[PDB]
Design a binder for this molecule. Structure first.
Ligand code: CJA
Length: 147
């Protein structure tokens, strides 16, 4: 089990990490973002967390930018209510790390590169995806130009 803490209230993991109900509970997690389409929402039957599925695939054509602000609003719900969010996808953490970096660019004032470094220092293995890097570049331009 390896639930990396990015911020005190924001956690990053893969499929295997999201199946530990005992560690999720120890970290005061009450929100879960599942950035896959086929995986189950783990522990939905226990009525312990609030969930959100961003239905995405690890494809070169997948748009994750459409989901950014739907996520940012679910993250800020947790930030305010005093609970933790787990954004998880699959082994490479390509999709979930993309959203994590995006939030750190809009709500922390970081640049894309500083965000990537911040996140790689805590979870050292984030496998690459050129499709998502391009979307972050566009997002960085949109924020500096007030959009
Ligand atoms: C937006 S990434 C970025 S910004 C500056 C650099 C990089 C980078 N990223 C990656 S892996 C991509 C990731 O982590 C996901 C996109 C899947 C979240 N390999 C190499 C580099 C070179 C240096």
């Amino acid at each position: 089990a390896e639930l990396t803490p990015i911020l005190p209230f924001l956690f990053l993991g893969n499929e295997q990490d999201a199946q530990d109900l005992d560690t999720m509970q120890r970290l005061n997690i009450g929100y879960v973002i599942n950035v896959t389409t086929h995986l189950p929402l783990y522990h939905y039957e226990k009525g312990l967390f609030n969930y959100k599925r961003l239905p995405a695939t690890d494809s070169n054509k997948q748009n994750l930018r459409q989901y950014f602000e739907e996520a940012f609003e679910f993250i800020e719900e947790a930030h305010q209510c005093g609970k933790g969010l787990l954004i998880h996808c699959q082994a490479g953490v390509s999709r979930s790390a993309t959203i994590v970096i995006a939030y750190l660019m809009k709500h922390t004032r970081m640049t894309m590169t500083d965000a990537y470094k911040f996140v790689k220092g805590k979870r050292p293995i984030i496998s690459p995806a050129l499709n998502f890097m391009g979307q972050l570049l566009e997002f960085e331009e949109d924020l500096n130009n007030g959009v």
